[PDB]
Every structure is written in structure tokens, then in C-alpha cells.
């Protein structure tokens, strides 16, 4: 009988960075029907399907007849995790960021292309809103990227502080999506903490989202174990040494801590190289209300919006040499749809609390 | 010796959406006797049997001789879960709803057909009672379906509030059955919470049923951790970002929260785009008492009752194009059994607290 | 079909001391392309790749076609752990230290060589700062190494005591990296303690880092279970007998305990042969501020910095005979870059709180 | 292809009493190179290597080519545990002690032989110090051995009571090493107790080391659950019946309980056939300070020191017939190095707090 | 190659009632050397060896060459447990007792035979002491056996109450050994209780040994959860219905509850068909002190002592027909060693607190 090439299944998982055994199994089985009459290839809207169907057709037919499908996929997903282990030790942090940027640019080429449904002007309206959230926003994003790539001990964490609806959660989520990584919850007791801290294994950055303090009930701020927990994770935050994570011995990822207006102990404050305070701006909330596509299409939380922001404001030299050709094609695309004049009109509209797109 | 086709067992599980290894094993073994003398095929009351017996007979005989039955079924059930993973990422939410609607219509074709035991007039009496529970009920159901399909961040949860016997539990259960999904219990301590929150993996919607508050003992309302737990799951409820679920990284499903008349903190209230208050109506309870078939046949909790409601009130254009032919056949079926005149008589009977069917 | 040599995969894991199944898998797969056109071999910056690619090429190609990759790697990683078991019982502690010294010297030959990116003068500036942290620092480091190698019962633990930014954490981390071993956290309750104490299995030394006491809130020192836990581990600290560790029956490793200025009970104090008090020195902090490369390149926490310190101050006879040839080549390398005169200038610069490198 | 003899691997584990799968794997792989050029055989310092290398060479070469090494070793280690099960039920307790005595004498032949590094006069100085710890010490050791071999119900436990540095921990550790067995910690809560009590499975004796009481803080004695726990283990201590141990249904091993000067409840006191009180003796501490080799080489905690003590004081008839030939050779060895005159000088030196060896 | 007969290994486990995989493995390997030169067969002191060596020699040699020894033994031990399942449902309780009696008589034939070391007169002295513990002791033992065999609901538990050294623990242990079964500890909290209650699966009887109450500290009686736990296990004690045990759905075994002089709640008291109060008798303690062999050889806790008691007092008709031939041979053996006259002298000696044997 015919033998399935485990190596070809592995190659597909590697090309698509597949970390889910069931997702790989499902995607591979979907290559078993003739590409000539494939409606999915014809629609050309899922690159992980249409760019691989022809190369994997004959092997996928054999795979459909296999009595050992889960094992084939488990080896393929293990090889992807093995590659991630190698890269976490050999790749420079700049190459890691280039890899994430190429991933976001692939999505961008799809959603804003001939077979996509995203509206580029809507994302650019998102860029304008984000550029109004803080002064020198392109520099704030750029200085954050440099802090994450350089990963300097004791100078690797930023504190985002402010009430709800201040944009702190949105910007931290957008930054996490731009760099790739995980959001953690440290509001649990120390007993459960180590398995949550384990979520940081081989991650480029982390966000300790919505960390809570105590005795702030008189200000209507909920109680939690977060601030105390963080105050006891100086080694995780400092990144001076490798920590023993459980779920690897590695430097805990750098990142962001977001929190409401709680009292920050002197010891925990010393852990942050920077603190950005987010305050409610009526015009930002009003403009967002008038530009519902931003909320509906989850634009403000997107790393593609921050990459678009960076491509709009920064020259080709501000990007690593390996992505120069993609930045050039994207700058040409943005010039066709918006000008510095119309971009400035969008920002004036945000400032007035008016719809961003006229 | 003869070899069992694992692929054919998988196809049967896929066609029947089988997620239970033991159920698949039992159903497949029941195909091993000759279809010509099969009493189950003759009775024609179980489509998952009678539509597959002929196609699976020879393979089922070989399967009966297999020394590896559980493994064959485990691969088949894994392929179904693999397909669900693919669909959760590639299918649009409208296609997901069409899939659930075709599932309910299959059941409807069976129970109200030549080999069924359900009484269509009884279900239509259920439609009349449900249409009396709230004003513009067909619009309330339709606006809910649009909120679940659109899945807009921060505008994805409805709050059903009221005492017991007010119809809040019944309507939330009927809506969950119409969309497909799971009911969750968050009245447990936060330590056990994450495995309950895990029940939401690849689910189209969820219901946090009968969430409890504190200090309402003076109103005879029981104490529980539910309201506090929900107030700490802003990220799960908002659906602005993907959450790390344990039992996948995904947007937590949208849905409903049902609760008795507890105090709702300002922070948790902000999480709900809509709040429907359910109050006891003597006529509704009296009419239900006089129409016992509704309780006995579990009609008021059924998604088939809400689909029948939708088919009765809404034109073919209000349904996705893919189910237009099935809606037409069902509208013709309903016209034969009830008219707008007799439907209005049923509602007047509900309003009087009289039996719905004269 | 061709058969993968499990023995050759094992040999690669043994030569590289590979303890991670996924890392081994990834590294071995990276040998599958022709060495003649290998960019990684051409770059010559990863010895675990370039020194093994030619020897493992044909086997790695066969390994890429294997349906049992994880099993091959699990046996290889088990053989490495088996070797560690044999060595923990048969190797003398001096041979164990020589093994760690040869590991650090391999890294040093790489980072300061033709294909490395480290700056030797920066590390020597680190040596000068460390030599200013305590009087007779080369003797303090040397007397520590003798205490760890001799492993004398009740005379095997040193206590590092002082406030934050006093250099106690940095020096303990640098000593742990020079000897090889693990840092432990005993601030948890006794229930979780035994699995943490298990981290010490086959380890040459341990550091109980940042151990906390109670009732020091009035001095802004956080509360924890550490000091009490240690006071109940007399058998672990004394090393008079073998302890039953869970994760082996062995003598618990010797080491260091670091802590802030808490009260030390008379019983726990008796456990330490030496106590070094670390006090803040403004000039040390100022000099470090002016010499940012030390913080950025994690030089002060490095065992390579302490080995460089030892090679600078101590003659060839102070090192075991087995590494005499490597010490000689390193003394010649250091003489080319620094003199006793310029080294003394660096220390005077530290003393002034000025940049270490002029 | 050549087949590895699993039976020969098992025989090696049986001859060496190997209970560790990884240690067996490592030791067996070390037999794969030619014995003719083996440096380890030439050094003749590890009998578990040099007495087996020639017999296992060809099989070890085949073992190096095996794809199932861990399984081969797991069966070998299971056979050793199987043998221990058989012996625990069929061997008399005298034969069990002879087995332990032959194990200690094997170590003694090695460390004090041509390829050993131990100094016999140092161990004999240890014998002199131990003989000064209590009156009639050779009789105390001999009466203990008889209590452990006879294993009489309710007359099987001795209580060692005294402050720290009184020699109670040292003597209990030395007795445990002379008989073979495990030290247990019962200071934990009853919930974790049963898995600790499980450490006693197939053990010849146990030591409940440093058991703590309550309300002794006013005497600077730490609090713990030990004394209370023991007071509830009358069945374990009495050994009248078999207990259900978890980690077997067996009589819990006899042994020793060591503790500081806590109050012992009347019920727990009744459990001990003997109580030896250890008080600080300045001369013993002073002599030990002047004879540092005892501490450095862990002589006072060694069962070889107590066996040497027994061989020095007791005639050949006091030992089981099966070890008479080994006792004779050891008495001849001791006569060459010490006389009753010089032994008495050593004891006088201990009594003066002077170095034991002049 | 030669094949090991798994069926023959199973037969050996069945003949010896082997429930331990490791013990079976060890015993089977000990059949591999020639029976002609077997010292163990020559000694004739272990029937599980000498009665099976010849029948299992050739198979044991093949077993020594097996690469799957643990699996062979696991199937054999599973077959023994399978047989126990069948017997627990099909055997009458009288047949179960006959099976236990034949097991004790096998041990008796060995220890009191030509190759045994037990002294029958010592056991008969034990019989005399036990016959002095309560009036009509042969009837008390006989009425207990009838209560356990009949297993009548609500009339299946006896309560043994008294201080320590009153003989309650000894007699309950002797009765448990005569019937076969397990001793349980219910002094733990209800959370751990169900796994302890699970120890009763397929057991003929159980003893809840040394059950504790509360608020008896003023009488120097320790506190525990036992009495409260038992008061909540009415269904387990009553045996009216099957209980769901976890570690089977079965009637919980009948048995005994032993306890010190605590207050017994009215509800728990109702659970016991009989209560025997044990009070200290100075003469019994004095006689035991003068007859140390009873304590040393664990005679008073032995089911063989109670069987000997029964054989001495009761005629052949009081025993089941299936063991009549063995009772006759044992009555002839006892008549040779003791008479009714000398037995009465032994009891008079117990009554005087004198040595039992003159
Ligand atoms: Zn396609
Ligand atoms: Zn059929
Ligand atoms: Zn290469
Ligand atoms: Zn050798
Ligand atoms: Zn034999």
C-alpha cells in the first residue's frame, strides 16, 4: 500500500507555523479533493489552503486513507515547536520582530487585496485615532519596539495607568499583536500563579493585563492579588537572569503592565523604565462613537493598524533591511489612498469628536 | 483478512457530526445486519440510521470483526473536531447560523413528517405563547440573531433579568438551542472557574444561566459568586481580544446572562448592550397550566419553536439565501395548519389565560 | 528502507549536553541540508551546529524521513541524564568544576573570537567593578569555589545579606553561573516546598534567592515564608546526610542564601559558615550608570566575568591541571588588551563613580 | 541483527542491587569500549564497573545499538524490586542484616584498600569519639541491632532525646546506615503523612528524625505536627499488625525517633522500649573541633564506623556465621593499625577535648 | 524462539492467590534453576516455592529469557482479581469462610510441621489466655462467625469498647485474621474518607480500628473525626443496600468497630447488634508479662490461635463438611500435646497472673 509522507505534512505545518494538531489534521484533509474543481482555490481567500493545495493533493489523498492521522500531525506540530526552541536560542530579537512583521504584512496583503473584504481607509482612520491618543505616537510605538528588541535588564517594562475607556487596554493589546506574544492574568492567588507565568515560554513579549490592587473600594476599583504578585516577581520583570518556568529555564519575556489608578508600591514602581498615564478624552470617545467600523472590525486593537501607522510616518530606513521591499510596496499603496493633507483632516475630525471619514 | 475502511467510518461521523466515540461505535455496529430485513430502516424514524445503513452495511460487518474498534472511532471523532477547528476559523458566523438552522430543519422534517410523533399545532401554540412573552417578539429574536452573527465587541451580551417563572430561563434556553452553544455556571469560586469558562471552546454562543449576587437574603434570593466572577471577566464578555481558554486562544463566545433581581454593579452593567426585564404575567402562567402539552413536550425551551416563530412572521428574504427553499416548503406547511386569523385567536386565548388550542 | 542511527543522535546530544527533547529534534533536523551550501556553517557562530553538521548530515537526512523522531530524541536525552547520574556518583567535585570551567571557556572562545560579537574590554571593565564590590574579591571568589568543591558538612553555606541594589543578587547569580546550578524560591508555603527543593537534583550548587522574613513591614521589607522554611531544612543545609528529594536520595547541594536585612533566628544563623554584608556604595551605582554596556550585556551576573577575574588575578597553579593550557592561552589574550596599570586605572574610575572605560 | 540479552542486563542490576533505571543505563553504556584499553578498569576504584566490564562488554556494545534501552533497564530494575519483595517475605531479619553488613564490608574493602583514598586511623578515631558518646557504647549498638533483628511488637522503638549538637542526630543516622533504611519527616500535616509513611515500604528500619512538639517557643524550640502525628500512629510504631502503606500491606519497620526536649504525652512515651537522653559534653565538641577530618569525611554518621566499632570490641562469635571470615580479616587489619593501648590513648584524648590523633 | 506459557504463569498465581505483580515476578524467576540441586526445595519451608518448582521449571527458564515479564505477570494478577470478582458474586459466605479456613490450616500444617519453627504449646497457651479474656469465649468467637457469614442487615456490626491494654484491639485483629479482610482508619476528614472506604472492595469483613470522638480531652482521650464519620455511614454499616465504593457497587462488608470510652450518639449506637466492653484485668497483663513468647511471636493477634481455640472446644459438626477431614487431623494433633486437664491448668495459671507454661 501507498505510504503518506510525514515529512511533507511537517513541511506544511512549518510553512504555516501550525501549533494545533486538530487544525493541521482538518486543513490537510481539505487538500484531498482535486485542485482543478476546488471552490476554495477558486475563491483565493485562505492562503494556508490555496498556496498549498496543489503541492499537497496526492499526499492528502494518501493521508485520508491513513489509520495513524493524529500521530502524523503530532510529529508535524512537534517539529514546529522544535523550530521555535531553536529560534528562541539562535535568532536575534530583530529577526524575531521581522518574522512577526512579515506575518502581519501577509495578512495585510490578503485582507486589503483582490480577494479581501477589509477597507484600507477604515484602518487609516484607526491610525488617525491612535495617533491622537498620545503626543508623538509614532515615536512612542517606535521607542516601545526598541525597548522590546533590545530587552535591556531592568529597562524592559512599561506601565500603562488609567481608568477604563482611557485607551490603555486597546494600545497594550495593539502593541502585543504588533510584537506577538501573550496576555497574562496575575489577579489569582500565588498557588495558581506559576502555571500562568508558564504562558510566557518562548514568547517575544507579554502583557500583564488589568492588574488589581487592594483598598481602592472607596474609589470603586475592584480588589485583587495582581499588584502584590508582581511586587514578588522582580526576577521575572528585571530579566537579569533566567527563571524556571513551568507548564523551561529562560529570561522571562519583556512587556507591559496595565492597571487602573491604584497605589503602586515604591519597590514595584522601580521595575518600570516608563509610565504612560491615560486619561479620558471626550473627543476620542465621541469620534469613536461616530466611526463604529473601528469597534465592529476590531481596528484599534490590531497590530496591522500600528504597522500601517509606522509605514505612514516612518521612512524605509526605520525598518530592518529584510522587509524594505514590502514597506516600499505598502508606502505606494497608502499614497494612493491618503495624503498628508487628508491624514491631517482625519486627525482634525478626531479632535472635533466628529466621524473620522467624511 | 478483510480490512475496515477507517475513511468510511470517518465519513459517517462527519455526515452525522458525531462527537461521541461510544455513540459512534454503537451506531456503526447497528449497521452490521442486512438492510433488507432491518426493522429500524422499515420504521424510518432515525435518519442517522436509515439514511446510512445501506452505504455502511459491508464495512460495518468488517467493523464487527475488528480488534481495534475504539481506535477507528477515536480517529473518526478527532476528524469531526478537526473540521470544527477549521470551520471556527474559516466559516463566517452567518454560515455557522445556516448550519445550525439546517440541523433544526432536519429534526423538524422528521418529528412533523410521516414517521414522526410531534403535533405541529402544539408547537404553533408554543409560538403564540412565546409571541405573548414580550412586545415585538419576532423582532426581539431577529435582533438577537443579528447581535450574535455580527459579534460586535462590547455589544455582544444581553442581560435577562427577573424573578423565577417570569420566562427568562425558558427564552434564554430557546435562544441557545436556536443558535447552538453551551450554558455555563459561574456561581462556583474563581479556582474552578477557568475549566467552566473552557466549556465555551468553538461554541457559537453561551448562556451564563442563573448568575447569583450577594446580600439579597432579605428578598429570599440565594447567595453566590456569579455576579462578582462576571465583573472580573470584562475580556471574556467584551470580545475585543482573544482569551486563553483551558479544558485554545480565541474570542470568548457572545451570548446572554440570566439572573434574578440582584443589584448589578455599574462596571458589570456597562458590559450589556441590552437588558430585558421579565415580570410575572398571571395570564401566561394560567394559559400554560391549561396547555400542558407545552411543558410535557418541552416546546417553550425549543429552538424549533423559535425557528417556527421566525418562519411564521418573517418573509423568505429575512433568511440567508442558502436556506430559501426549506423556508418556502415550511411556510407552505404552516399555511395548511394555521392562518393569521387562527394565530391571532391563539394569542387572544393566551391573553385570557385560556387553553391555547380550542 | 534506510535506518536512522539512534546511537549517532545520542552522541550529538552527549557532545552538546542536550537535556531538551524539542531542542535536540530542531538542531538535528537543521543538519539535513548539504554542508557545502550551509550558510550557518559559513557564518561559524553556533558551534553546536558548525562542529557537528558534516558528521551528522547523512543521518539527519534519514532522520528527516523518520516516523519516530520524538522517540529517537527521548532516548538520546535519557542517555544524557543517565550520564549525569553516573557522573554525580563517580566524578570528584573538582572534575565537576573543571567540566563547568571548560563549558564557560568554550562560550568565551566563541563570543570573543573571530565570529563573536562580545567586547573583551567591556567584560574586563565588569571584572574591575566586581573587584571593587568587596575587599580581596579574587580571594572571596576563590574561597567560595573551595567551600563548594570541598562540600564540608555544616560549612557549605554562605549568607549574602543587604538591601536592594547592594550587589548581593548580582554576585550570587554570577557565582551560580561560574559553578553551574539552580536558583530556588522558598517564599512559598511548606506544602509546595518539596517540589521546589526537588530542583536541586544532581545540581553542583544552589542559590536560595531573596529569602523573606516576617514583621519587617515597618522597614518596608515584604513578608514571606522563606526564613521559617529554611530554619526547618537543617538537614538540607547541613549536608551531613542524604535527603529524599522529589520531582532521588542524595546530599542536598551546597550554596548561597541571599536576603534583605531581616532578623535571622539563632538556629538558622548557625547554618552559615560565612556571612557577607552588602551595603550600598554610591560610587559603584554611579560608575555602573556611566557604563551601561554592563547592564545591557548582562556582564555583572556572568560566570565568564568571574572566570576572567580569576584568570586575571591568579596564576596557572591556582587552576586544576586539566585546564592549564586554556588558562595560559586566556592569560596571553588578556595581556594583549589590558595591563596591571590600565586595570588599576579602571578600578580608580569605579572608585570615582566615572565611566570605567576612558 | 544482533539481539541484546535482557537477562544479562538484569543480572548486572541484580549483582549491583540497581534500583535506578537511569543509573543502570549509564553504567551499562560505560561497558561498551574495549576492557583492554579501559582507564576505569586500570584505576580499579569503582567495583560496579571493573568487576563487570569484561562479562558485559559484548552485550553493552549491542545495547549501545538498541532502540529500546529504557525498556531493557526498566525490566532489569523491576526484577531487583521483585527480588526485594521475595526477600522481604522469605528472608529472616538476621539474613537481612548479614546482607547489609556484606554491603558495608564491600565499601570498606574498597575505600581502605590499594585503590582507596580513606584513612583507617581516621575512622578508628571516629570509633573512639562514638565510644565516648555514651557508656557501654558497643553494648548500646549491639542491643539496638538485637531489638531491630528480633522486631518484637511494642518493643521495637527507641527514643533519642536531647538538644542540638548533643550527638542524637549523628548516632541515629549512623545506626540507620549500619542497618539500612530510610529517615522520615512527620512534621507535615496528616493530609500529606500517608505518602511519607509510604517511604517505609520493604525498609529494614526507619528514623523519624527531629520530630517537633508544640508550645515550646518559650524554650526556643520550634513548633511542628510531629509529636501529635506519632501519637496517632500506635499501629505503625507497635508493629503488632500489618498496616496498609501507600506510595503494600506489611508490618511498619522498627526504628528510632529523635527529638529535642519537648513534652512527650504518656500515650506516646509508652511506645518506646528505651529512651536515651543526649546532653552536651564540652570535651566531645572540643575534640571534634580539633579532629576536623571527622566532620569533613562524614565519619561520625557512617555505618562503617559503627561496624568498625563492633569489629574492634566484639569477638567473631558475636557476628552471624556467614560473615565470620570477613570479620577475621578485618580484625587482623585493625590489629596492624591500632592496639588496645593506643585505642585507650585516643579515648583519653577525646576526654581531654584534644585532637584524637597525636 | 521458545514461547513462555502465560496460562501456566496465571495458574501459579491462581494456585497461590498472588495479587502482587512484583512478588509473582520474583517467585517465578526463582523456579529457573534445576529442582534437583535446589536448596529451597531441599529445605521444604516455603510451599509456594517447593510445591510448584518442578511443574514450573521449564516455563520459568523461558520466562527468564522474556522481554515482556511484567506484562505476563500483570495478566496473571488480573486473572486472580477476575476470579475474586466471580467468587464475590457466586460463592456463598460459608464457602468464603471455608476458603479462609483452608488458607490458615495450610500455614498451620507448615509452621507446626517437620520443616516449621513454631511451638504448638505456645499457641495453645495463647488459646488459654484468649479463653480468659471474656466468658464463653468459644461461643463469642462462634457467634461472631455466624453474624459475619449470615450478614444480616442492621445486625452485622459489633462494637468493642474499652481503654488501651484491655484486649479489644488484639481480639478484633485476631477475628479479622480468622475471617480475612481489612482494617480501616476513619479518623481522617470526610474529603479523604471515600478512598479509605474503598479498601473494603471484595473484602469478607472490615475493622474500623481505634475510632475517636471529640471533647474527651478531660479523660486524656485524643480527638478525631471517626465517631462523626461513622454516624454518617448508616448505609455502609446497615448493609441493607449496595453502596458505590471508589478506589464497585456492592454491600459494604460487615465487621467490628473498636474504640476507647467515648460517648456514642444514640443514632450510631443503634447500628450495633452487640457491644462488648473490655476492662483491664491485672492477671491477664501479668500472665502475658510472664509469657513473653505470646508478644514476641504475635500469637494473640493470630487467626490461627482462634482457629486452634475453635478446634479445641468445638466438635467436628460445628465446622463446614468440606473441612471435616482437616479438623479431625488437627484434633488428633492437639490431643497429643494437651489434655482438658492440662488446658484447665493453663487457664488457672492465667487467672493467677503466672507463666502459662510450667
Ligand atoms: Zn483548493
Ligand atoms: Zn437499518
Ligand atoms: Zn551547517
Ligand atoms: Zn572498564
Ligand atoms: Zn526449588
From Swiss-Prot, chains A, B, C, D, E:
Segment forming the signal sequence: none
Major location category of this protein: host cell
Binding residues for ATP: 162-169
GO cellular component, one term: host cell nucleus
Domain of life: Viruses
Maturation and modification: Phosphorylated on both serine and threonine residues. Small t antigen inhibits the dephosphorylation by the AC form of PP2A.
Residue spans, zinc finger T-ag D1-type: 1-93
CC cofactor: Mg(2+)
Entry binding sites for Zn(2+): 49, 53
Function: Isoform large T antigen is a key early protein essential for both driving viral replication and inducing cellular transformation. Plays a role in viral genome replication by driving entry of quiescent cells into the cell cycle and by autoregulating the synthesis of viral early mRNA. Displays highly oncogenic activities by corrupting the host cellular checkpoint mechanisms that guard cell division and the transcription, replication, and repair of DNA. Participates in the modulation of cellular gene expression preceeding viral DNA replication.
Domain notes from UniProt: The J domain is essential for multiple viral activities, including virion assembly, viral DNA replication, transformation and transcriptional activation.
Protein name: Large T antigen
Organism whose genome encodes this protein: JC polyomavirus (JCPyV)
Lineage: Viruses, Monodnaviria, Shotokuvirae, Cossaviricota, Papovaviricetes
Parent sequence residues shown: 266 to 628 of 688
